[PDB]
From a paper:
Various transport systems are present to maintain intracellular Cu homeostasis, including the prokaryotic plasmid‐encoded multiprotein pco operon, which is generally assigned as a defense mechanism against elevated Cu concentrations. 23 While PcoA is a periplasmic multicopper oxidase, distantly related to CueO, [name] resides in the outer membrane and has an elusive function. Here we structurally and functionally characterize the outer membrane component of the Pco system, [name], recovering a 2.0 Å structure, revealing a classical β‐barrel architecture. Aggregated, our findings indicate that [name] serves to permit Cu import.
From this region, a funnel‐like pore is penetrating almost the entire barrel, becoming narrower towards the periplasm, with a remarkably electronegative funnel surface throughout (bottom right). However, the structure was obtained in Cu‐free conditions, and consequently there are no indications of the metal in the pore.
Numbering used by the authors: 90 to 229, 239 to 296
Write the structure that this text describes.
């Protein structure tokens, strides 16, 4: 009936001797009370997609801005794949906020939880500063946090180039493995990209 295509982040990322193209896409299709969400979010470098993740979710409205979502998450790595059942809650109001809390369950008793949010701070009607956060837990369990700041200029409302920074931290076993591989367990990542929706 209607739809929204929101390519929320299409961005090249630069940190310590790393470089990738990353994406975060969060789109939906349907009616006023029920919709199908298509989410996708991933990284590639050197023509090799290092990692990709997709979710297909039924969203049922529970109030003016919030949906209950239930569906499937599919993770891809070059030599492996993993399927999760997903259930959570998703809020979205364009030019205001997005917020999500989703749990995931997979075969081997594996569970995960993701918290995320962003909100728009209008500097002008077209220059918009967007702080964001994402928190990931895994249990077989806090694994990682990303605190972002993206400054976009809406040329068109449909094409908004931006620059930004993300403060990324690892925790616990993920942090210990990072250090064991000779790497810091935190990064400042620099971003250039575009936000596109229609
Ligand atoms: C509030 C905005 C913070 C601005 C931080 C500075 C961003 C500077 O970098 C912008 C251009 O670079 C972005 C990432 O680079 C792409 C990765 O590959 C490039 C290879 O050089
Ligand atoms: C279970 C997740 C909790 C999310 C908290 C939601 C905030 C409640 C108020 C925002 C809007 C609620 N509303 C109006 C959609 O019903």
């Amino acid at each position: 009936i209607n739809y929204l295509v929101l390519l929320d982040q299409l961005e090249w990322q630069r940190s310590d001797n790393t470089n990738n193209f990353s994406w975060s896409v969060n789109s939906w299709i349907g009616g006023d009370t029920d919709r199908i969400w298509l989410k996708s979010e991933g990284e590639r470098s050197n023509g090799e997609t290092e990692a990709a993740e997709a979710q297909l979710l039924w969203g049922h409205a529970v109030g003016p801005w919030w949906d209950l979502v239930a569906g499937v998450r599919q993770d891809f790595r070059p030599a492996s794949a993993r399927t999760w059942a997903a259930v959570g809650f998703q809020g979205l109001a364009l030019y205001n906020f997005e917020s999500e809390i989703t749990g995931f369950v997979s075969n081997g008793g594996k569970a995960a939880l993701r918290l995320g949010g962003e909100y728009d701070v209008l500097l002008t009607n077209r220059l918009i500063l967007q702080p964001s956060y994402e928190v990931n837990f895994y249990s077989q369990g806090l694994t990682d946090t990303e605190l972002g700041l993206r400054l976009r200029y809406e040329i068109r409302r449909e094409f908004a180039p931006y620059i930004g920074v993300s403060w990324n931290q690892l925790y616990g076993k993920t942090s210990d493995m990072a250090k064991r591989e000779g790497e810091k367990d935190h990064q400042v990542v620099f971003l250039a990209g575009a936000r596109i929706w229609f």
